[PDB]
């Protein structure tokens, strides 16, 4: 029984490390970056065009 | 002669009025636009506090 038990349990334990293994690999690089707007207040008035 | 230089007085008084006219024309035309872009720019400021409140909640 213990035989059964370790030959199960090392199978779902082999495909869950192997599972594992592509969130080791990267975790964080899938994400985009920010570029949220803020600031840009010293920009001037009069645009040097004419969409002012 | 004191419609002449009445005139002469009144002509240079014209002449500095207009100059003045044209200068703080200019001035409120920019201003203008300063305030208009300084306007946009809040309004800017408050759809990204908004971002910042929904994302923080």
């Known amino acids: 029984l213990g035989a059964r038990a370790k030959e199960s349990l090392d199978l779902r334990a082999h495909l869950k490390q192997v599972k594992k293994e592509d969130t080791e690999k990267e975790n964080r690089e899938v994400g985009d970056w920010r570029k949220n707007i803020d600031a840009l207040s010293g920009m001037e008035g ?6 002012s | 002669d004191k419609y002449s230089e009445a005139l002469k007085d009144a002509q240079e008084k014209l002449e500095l009025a ?6 703080a024309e200019a001035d ?21 506090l908004a ?5 923080l909640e």
């Open chain 2, 18 to 23: 207009e100059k003045k006219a044209t200068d």
């Open chain 1, 46 to 51: 009069r645009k040097k065009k004419f969409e």
């Open chain 2, 51 to 55: 971002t910042a409140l929904q994302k």
């Open chain 2, 28 to 48: 409120v035309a920019s201003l203008n636009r300063r305030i208009q872009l300084v306007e946009e720019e809040l309004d800017r400021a408050q759809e990204r």
